[PDB]
Design a protein around this ligand. Structure first.
Ligand SMILES: C=CC1=C(C)[C@@H](Cc2[nH]c(/C=C3N=C(/C=C4\NC(=O)[C@H](C)[C@H]4CC)C(C)=C\3CCC(=O)O)c(CCC(=O)O)c2C)NC1=O
Ligand SMILES: C=CC1=C(C)[C@@H](Cc2[nH]c(/C=C3N=C(/C=C4\NC(=O)[C@H](C)[C@H]4CC)C(C)=C\3CCC(=O)O)c(CCC(=O)O)c2C)NC1=O
Ligand SMILES: C=CC1=C(C)[C@@H](Cc2[nH]c(/C=C3N=C(/C=C4\NC(=O)[C@H](C)[C@H]4CC)C(C)=C\3CCC(=O)O)c(CCC(=O)O)c2C)NC1=O
Ligand SMILES: C=CC1=C(C)[C@@H](Cc2[nH]c(/C=C3N=C(/C=C4\NC(=O)[C@H](C)[C@H]4CC)C(C)=C\3CCC(=O)O)c(CCC(=O)O)c2C)NC1=O
Ligand SMILES: C=CC1=C(C)[C@@H](Cc2[nH]c(/C=C3N=C(/C=C4\NC(=O)[C@H](C)[C@H]4CC)C(C)=C\3CCC(=O)O)c(CCC(=O)O)c2C)NC1=O
Ligand SMILES: C=CC1=C(C)[C@@H](Cc2[nH]c(/C=C3N=C(/C=C4\NC(=O)[C@H](C)[C@H]4CC)C(C)=C\3CCC(=O)O)c(CCC(=O)O)c2C)NC1=O
Ligand SMILES: C=CC1=C(C)[C@@H](Cc2[nH]c(/C=C3N=C(/C=C4\NC(=O)[C@H](C)[C@H]4CC)C(C)=C\3CCC(=O)O)c(CCC(=O)O)c2C)NC1=O
Ligand SMILES: C=CC1=C(C)[C@@H](Cc2[nH]c(/C=C3N=C(/C=C4\NC(=O)[C@H](C)[C@H]4CC)C(C)=C\3CCC(=O)O)c(CCC(=O)O)c2C)NC1=O
Ligand SMILES: C=CC1=C(C)[C@@H](Cc2[nH]c(/C=C3N=C(/C=C4\NC(=O)[C@H](C)[C@H]4CC)C(C)=C\3CCC(=O)O)c(CCC(=O)O)c2C)NC1=O
Ligand SMILES: C=CC1=C(C)[C@@H](Cc2[nH]c(/C=C3N=C(/C=C4\NC(=O)[C@H](C)[C@H]4CC)C(C)=C\3CCC(=O)O)c(CCC(=O)O)c2C)NC1=O
Ligand SMILES: C=CC1=C(C)[C@@H](Cc2[nH]c(/C=C3N=C(/C=C4\NC(=O)[C@H](C)[C@H]4CC)C(C)=C\3CCC(=O)O)c(CCC(=O)O)c2C)NC1=O
Ligand SMILES: CCC1=C(C)[C@@H](CC2=N/C(=C\c3[nH]c(C[C@@H]4NC(=O)C(C)=C4CC)c(C)c3CCC(=O)O)C(CCC(=O)O)=C2C)NC1=O
Ligand SMILES: CCC1=C(C)[C@@H](CC2=N/C(=C\c3[nH]c(C[C@@H]4NC(=O)C(C)=C4CC)c(C)c3CCC(=O)O)C(CCC(=O)O)=C2C)NC1=O
Ligand SMILES: CCC1=C(C)[C@@H](CC2=N/C(=C\c3[nH]c(C[C@@H]4NC(=O)C(C)=C4CC)c(C)c3CCC(=O)O)C(CCC(=O)O)=C2C)NC1=O
Lengths: 59, 164, 65, 233, 177, 164, 177, 177, 164
């Protein structure tokens, strides 16, 4: 669920270097195949193989 | 999809006339400048991934506020849509370099982009920051060639002048 | 609505209000603003300009006249 | 109004200020359909050609053509009044009638007065002035966000596919105007420009046929509340 | 309206990728072929009225029922519309030779022609015969093997290009049938 | 007056768009084929008198009936109108070679010629005889050059196909 | 619409003679200059929106009575039509640089402009000021001496061509006044 | 639009021959029929609005469901369009009496009328009833046997022409059904 | 070949009796519905060419991927086989329309079709697109008698429900 309600991280107050942005795949063709299933875009990312289990039960 | 061929065919067709020597001189010029355009298209198809990566990285390097509150790229997903969009723009620059007119770039990329961009709150200045970064990352003798490099600059400048 | 004569005589309005599609200069030079004159009282002012013209509406020259 | 196909696919308007011969020819094809006029008919229209080589009132050109026996002969003498009114819409405006009321208006302006008042009624429409004015040759317009959807369907269906020539064909919009049913999807589909993916709707198959919209069919609608579904009828 | 270039680009757009090496290689052969194409279009253009004259006159003389009373060439006006249509067909074939792709010929003229000649009562077999005569005449001019005109060009093989022009005329003649 | 420049400027103007790279390639081809066209124009301006004289001489050499009854050139004056007309057509071939389209030849010579010629009983076949004589009197390396010679042939062929 | 070529041809038509030697010699210098004109038009086109922005913004900042209430720049729609007109002026100047003759600029845009801006109440001196700013900015791009952009070209003198472009802008600014 | 003359000419064109003797003999009977046709058209024209009034009023009074609420004569605008249509039908029948051939009536009005009245929901039987009343009224005026008007003409037999006008009205009434 | 009279003759024959009054009433209904069937057959034999032309044109209007590459209809010959197949189908609808049962349409067109369209990589959905176009586009009042239109639509529906 993890949702903060009253919450804003400014990301303009940070020092000029320390805003880093990373894209999993830097391509057009591989972010979306012709068919619907996707591992990045849409709700289709929900249906990747793996990640079905959970490791937070250690608490 | 506008090119030399479609311009002179479209014009001589609009007159209802057989294609005279003028049209033949036009396509003569197309096959003169062709080798430069195809050279820059080959090299763009060579290293497009580093081009898009450096382009988007400088795009968030300038405007950091996008990944802050954001009414912008505010997830890894939207940054993936960012680098997808830069992939599309570079792919259309490749297409316009192969056709040799601004045809596919205008009819696929530029036409009606402004309603999408003002509707989905997407700022144009970020794209302009990306393209000006790539245009400053050009080389005179090093990466492409002098003359074809100029062709590439022209195409990218068209994008900027269509967006601002 | 407005009579076909009357529309020719009247005026051309501003763009963003009266007409969506922008207009060629030709139509400002040719139709435009169309005022005829009173009779001229003096030897000096008679033969220089024509008087009120009928079934024709000039534009932008009648400003200067 | 985005106007998706206005400049991207459809050729540009033939404005007056370029060479006169191209304006004259393009107006022949538009005012006429693909009429394919011959030597006699062009000699017979010479005085309108003179009036338009002189001043570029293409509005007055179209008026002068539609008043002439070359246009009157074919369309007003070989062709029946239903098809006459409809073609008149197509030749002058570029577009079809959007409703039964307007078709009744044009027919009424015919029957009260005559042919010339009708022609001056098309040429003096405010809609015609905003689309074309005195200086631009008639053409088919892709506005987007039209007043009626039926205006788009009938307009495209009556703007035929490249190489039109209404001299063979028979009137497709009479039952369509009076009934209010829009034309067949195939004729609409044939007339669209290239790259519009002509008629890739028409879901047909074992499942999801849904080939003809049916007016009388009852209306159903389901929404999802955390409890379950509300169906509103 | 799509040339060679636009065909490569649109196919690479459906494939969603950049244009690539092999497609650009075939397009180098297009540019490489070059001036052969230019001079070919010059040959088909600079004889074109005469091609239309010979072809339609041959069409009537092979099938004398067209000029028979009741046939579709029986009037002066029908004959003028006939010559006009043959001129237009040769015009769009010349456009398809400049472009290198038959998208212009498919979008302009070919789409809705059989339904037109069905609507007018024009016999389709006679039109395909006239198209075939324009095909043989046109390839005979394109190889410079005309029996009345032999113009000077530097010598060079042009089998490929002649097969291309014959492909366009066979597209038209197959399209009206 | 149609040329490469007027075609692409007229087209870009019709679109309301700045002149892109495609127009620049068209005019690039015009300045490629330019030297050939101007060579043929210089040589035509060299010996035009002999060209026109041999042309009209072969024109009456074919059709002798004109100078017989004639409903044609039936005086020395009308034969002077004949050689004047061929002077005009060679001068328009010169102009079309300099412009490098069929512009001035079409708008000055071809446009409305048919009404004049059917009104004043002038057969077109005699003109065609004259020009086909000149086109047969060409030379491959001798008088002009190969390539430019081809240019000249094209222009003259246009005249014939506009007249028949 | 007449280029350099059509100007030589029409002048030789009024003279009633053939083309000759000296006129073709000057036209060889036109062709001889070649690309410099090409790359010049490329420089003025590939900066053009930015030229229009800077020039009209400079026009307002020099004379703040335009943006004052009651001025002809005071509204969004007036400002939009203003930017649109500056874009058109630079467009026809670029056409006049490709053609080499100002017949296109005289027939398209310059004909009936003074009476139009008189009819609308547009101040003419402010338009001539904006044209002058486009002139200085455009020649600064054409000599590659912009303070914000310095693009790579092989070296060569281009004074003549810059004087030509300045002649077209002085034709426009003299035309509105 | 074809009269009797054009019918003879078009039939002789399909036959591909000259005009001859017998067809011209029947056309001589047409021209000798002449002033009877002229005065007949004068009789049908100079009573025409009153014929339409009586015929449509008779149509309503024979079938009172038309004026019933929900019927196709129930409104003022429906009634006006009704009278307008009856007036047009009598107009084209008068044209067919001047021409002598029903090609004008077939090309102008009759072509596409059944599908129009089907598209509007107009009952066809009521229209055929109104056409029949215009037929009987019109032949009663054409024999000068009206019970309210007896105008002066020289006497003579006109059965053939009355059968012709009845053939046109039966063409219309058979066409709507 | 199934019809009314073949069903009742074959049924009484399987019984082993003379045809009683029930079979006589069945063939009485055959000669009642006969006139509407034959009217529909007359009009179908009237304009079969335009029906098949609209059928194939809409079939490739709906489906375009048939034209490209491996898929059927790519070449002119295969598309000629396409319109030939639809010619066969309308000719079988005419035959079953004359017979009045689905007999000749079943035994000549439907029986064993599935192995053939399955084996020869022929999609049936395109056939259904053709027939549903010819099914949707007709007016009973305008071009046929009311009963005939019903009969035609019935036969065509049989084709569709037998196809896929
Ligand atoms: C054929 C060419 C072609 C393009 C060029 C793109 C252009 C484009 N981008 C978006 C859409 C988008 N584009 C971006 C990209 C951005 N994220 C940012 O932080 C930057 C400002 C910017 C990258 C530089 C984002 C974030 C969206 C989604 C916007 C949103 O939903 O809020 C959309 C709407 C549809 C969608 O959501 O995908 C379109 C049409 N699409 C095309 O079809
Ligand atoms: C929107 C506003 C608007 C108006 C105010 C009118 C004004 C107007 N009146 C006429 C036209 C006319 N107006 C009159 C009227 C006159 N008869 C006389 O005896 C008097 C002097 C005068 C009434 C006081 C007449 C008689 C005509 C016809 C003139 C003619 O044809 O001779 C016309 C020309 C078109 C036409 O014939 O109708 C116009 C534009 N029309 C408009 O659209
Ligand atoms: C002191 C007295 C005095 C007059 C009486 C006028 C008379 C007059 N009229 C015109 C000029 C003109 N006058 C008319 C008028 C006409 N339009 C037509 O359709 C009708 C025939 C006629 C109105 C009844 C027109 C149209 C012109 C311009 C003619 C042209 O330029 O072609 C001119 C030439 C100068 C000009 O263009 O204005 C003069 C001197 N001027 C004077 O100073
Ligand atoms: C008066 C009412 C009225 C409407 C309701 C619309 C309906 C409409 N939409 C389009 C046209 C269009 N409509 C859409 C919309 C779609 N994009 C998708 O991804 C979705 C399936 C869908 C939105 C839910 C698109 C994409 C086009 C352009 C289609 C194309 O050119 O390929 C057109 C053709 C003209 C044009 O291109 O604009 C028309 C008439 N227009 C009107 O005048
Ligand atoms: C853009 C492409 C394009 C075409 C390809 C043509 C096709 C075409 N031809 C005709 C029309 C015609 N085409 C012909 C031609 C024929 N005469 C014969 O003897 C032969 C069978 C055949 C030549 C081989 C004739 C005779 C007509 C007139 C038919 C008639 O009126 O009876 C028409 C109807 C309009 C008209 O009458 O001109 C059209 C659209 N038109 C176009 O716009
Ligand atoms: C602007 C218009 C324009 C043209 C029309 C062409 C015309 C043209 N063709 C060639 C040159 C050539 N053209 C051909 C073509 C031919 N091969 C044959 O078998 C046939 C006879 C013929 C095609 C029908 C060949 C083979 C050459 C090369 C000749 C050689 O080098 O031997 C050349 C010399 C330069 C070169 O080698 O490319 C030129 C100017 N070029 C132009 O710029
Ligand atoms: C700008 C280009 C241009 C041309 C090409 C000519 C074309 C031309 N020729 C004539 C007119 C003429 N041209 C000829 C020429 C002919 N005599 C014959 O025996 C031959 C058939 C033929 C020469 C080959 C003659 C004889 C006349 C006069 C005809 C007459 O008056 O009967 C005329 C009518 C005006 C006149 O009488 O001069 C024109 C427009 N004029 C132009 O302005
Ligand atoms: C199709 C597009 C197209 C272009 C955009 C031009 C680009 C172009 N410019 C030059 C070449 C040149 N370009 C310039 C231009 C100038 N140098 C200056 O210092 C000034 C800043 C500027 C004024 C305009 C000069 C001076 C040369 C070299 C001299 C010359 O070749 O005339 C060349 C010669 C080849 C080379 O240098 O490698 C080419 C192809 N030509 C084209 O075909
Ligand atoms: C220019 C106008 C014009 C007309 C209107 C007619 C009028 C007219 N009708 C007749 C003559 C005639 N008109 C009729 C017509 C009639 N038959 C009847 O049964 C009805 C009463 C009536 C039709 C409604 C007949 C029958 C004759 C011949 C009378 C006779 O010879 O007895 C004549 C004498 C010359 C002739 O015999 O044709 C004239 C002048 N002629 C004209 O030139
Ligand atoms: C008596 C009824 C009867 C039929 C209904 C047909 C059915 C049929 N079609 C084909 C055969 C064929 N049918 C088609 C038709 C198609 N092309 C396409 O693009 C579309 C999917 C489809 C038209 C809508 C094609 C292309 C072939 C040839 C297939 C091939 O050889 O690859 C064959 C195999 C024999 C042959 O090659 O002709 C048969 C039996 N034949 C009959 O005897
Ligand atoms: C053997 C059986 C058989 C049929 C069932 C018809 C079916 C049919 N109808 C049309 C053609 C047509 N059919 C209609 C009918 C319609 N008008 C509308 O308002 C309604 C939607 C619909 C009546 C209910 C129209 C209007 C056309 C002409 C369409 C056009 O040209 O736009 C055509 C094309 C040829 C033509 O134009 O006639 C065909 C094959 N034809 C046949 O041979
Ligand atoms: C009596 C009614 C009649 C005609 C009209 C002709 C028409 C005609 N020309 C042909 C074919 C034909 N026509 C020409 C063109 C033509 N030849 C030239 O050398 C020049 C300069 C030409 C234009 C002036 C060529 C070049 C060919 C190819 C044969 C050849 O080598 O000459 C063919 C052969 C068609 C085929 O191969 O299938 C025919 C039928 N034939 C007739 O029976
Ligand atoms: C405070 C309100 C205000 C402005 C707004 C500017 C506007 C302005 N720019 C000028 C002129 C000008 N402007 C530019 C374009 C500009 N410079 C570049 O290097 C780049 C990349 C540009 C677009 C981003 C150039 C290239 C010049 C020519 C001068 C130069 O060499 O920089 C001039 C001089 C006009 C003249 O010479 O007559 C003015 C007035 N001035 C003002 O007072
Ligand atoms: C109460 C609702 C009602 C009506 C309305 C009338 C309408 C009517 N008029 C008729 C027929 C009819 N109507 C006229 C025209 C008419 N007569 C004239 O003399 C003049 C000057 C006329 C126009 C003013 C004529 C000439 C006839 C032919 C009979 C006759 O000789 O009068 C007929 C006979 C139709 C037939 O023969 O089949 C009818 C039904 N009848 C009704 O019951």
């Amino acid at each position: 669920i993890a949702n903060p309600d009253v919450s804003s991280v400014d990301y303009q107050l940070m020092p000029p270097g320390s805003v880093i942005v990373q894209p999993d795949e830097v391509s057009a063709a591989k972010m979306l195949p012709v068919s619907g299933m996707s591992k990045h875009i849409g709700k289709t990312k929900r249906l990747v193989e793996g990640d079905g289990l959970s490791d937070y039960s250690r608490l | 999809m506008k090119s030399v061929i479609t311009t002179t065919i479209s014009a001589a067709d609009a007159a209802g006339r057989f294609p005279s020597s003028s049209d033949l001189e036009s396509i003569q010029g197309n096959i003169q400048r062709a080798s430069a355009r195809l050279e820059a298209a080959e090299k763009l198809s060579g290293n497009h991934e580093a081009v898009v990566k450096e382009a988007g990285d400088a795009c968030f390097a300038k405007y950091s506020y996008l990944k802050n509150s954001g009414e912008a790229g505010d997830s890894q997903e939207k940054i993936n849509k960012c680098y997808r969009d830069v992939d599309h723009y570079m792919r259309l620059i490749n297409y316009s370099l192969v056709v040799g007119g601004t045809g596919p770039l205008d009819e696929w990329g530029i036409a009606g982009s402004r309603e999408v961009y003002r509707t989905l709150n997407l700022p144009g200045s970020a794209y302009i920051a990306s393209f000006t970064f790539t245009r400053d990352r050009l080389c005179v003798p090093r990466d492409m060639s002098s003359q074809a490099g100029v062709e590439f600059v022209a195409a990218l400048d068209y994008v900027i002048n269509s967006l601002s | 609505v407005v009579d076909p004569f009357q529309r020719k005589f009247q005026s051309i309005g501003k763009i963003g209000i009266d007409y969506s599609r922008p207009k060629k200069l030709a139509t400002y030079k040719r139709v435009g603003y169309s005022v005829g004159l009173d009779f001229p009282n003096a030897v000096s002012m008679a033969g220089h300009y024509s008087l009120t013209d009928c079934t024709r509406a000039g534009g932008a020259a009648k400003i200067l006249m | 109004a985005f106007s998706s196909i206005d400049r991207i696919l459809t050729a540009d308007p033939v404005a007056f200020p370029n060479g006169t011969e191209s304006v004259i020819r393009a107006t022949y094809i538009q005012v006429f359909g693909n009429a394919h006029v011959m030597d006699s008919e062009r000699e017979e229209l010479a005085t309108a050609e003179s009036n338009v080589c002189r001043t570029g009132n293409v509005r007055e050109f179209v008026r002068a053509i539609v008043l002439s026996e070359n246009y009157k002969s074919r369309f007003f003498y070989s062709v029946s009044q239903y098809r006459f009114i409809e073609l008149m819409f197509k030749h002058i405006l570029g577009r079809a009638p959007e409703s039964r009321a307007e078709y009744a208006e044009a027919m009424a302006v015919y029957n009260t007065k005559g042919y010339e008042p009708l022609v001056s009624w098309f040429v003096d429409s405010l809609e015609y002035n905003e689309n074309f004015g005195s200086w631009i040759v008639p053409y088919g317009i892709y506005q987007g966000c039209y007043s009626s959807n039926e205006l788009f369907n009938r307009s495209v269906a009556m703007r035929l596919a490249p190489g039109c020539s209404d001299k063979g064909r028979s009137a497709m919009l009479q039952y369509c105007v009076l009934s209010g049913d829009s034309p067949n999807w195939l004729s609409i589909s044939k007339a669209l420009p290239a790259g519009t993916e002509k008629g890739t709707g028409l879901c047909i198959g074992g499942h999801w046929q849904s080939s003809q919209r049916n007016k009388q069919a009852p209306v159903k609608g389901k929404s999802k509340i955390p409890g379950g579904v509300i169906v509103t009828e | 309206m799509l040339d060679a270039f636009s065909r490569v680009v649109v196919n690479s757009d459906s494939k969603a990728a950049y244009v690539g090496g092999s497609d650009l290689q075939s397009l180098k052969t297009f540019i490489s072929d070059g001036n052969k194409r230019l001079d070919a279009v010059n040959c088909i253009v600079s004889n074109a009225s005469c091609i239309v004259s010979d072809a339609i006159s041959g069409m009537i003389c092979e099938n004398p029922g067209l000029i028979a009373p009741g046939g579709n060439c029986y009037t002066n006006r029908r004959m003028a519309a006939c010559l006009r249509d043959g001129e237009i067909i040769l015009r769009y074939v010349s456009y398809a030779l400049l472009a290198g792709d038959s998208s212009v010929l498919d979008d302009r003229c070919l789409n809705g022609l059989k339904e037109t000649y069905i609507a007018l009562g024009v016999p389709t077999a006679s039109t395909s015969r006239a198209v075939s005569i324009m095909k043989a005449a046109s390839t005979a001019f394109i190889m410079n093997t005309a029996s009345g005109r032999k113009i000077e060009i530097a010598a060079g093989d042009c089998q490929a290009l002649q097969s291309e022009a014959a492909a366009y005329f066979d597209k038209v003649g197959s399209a009206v049938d």
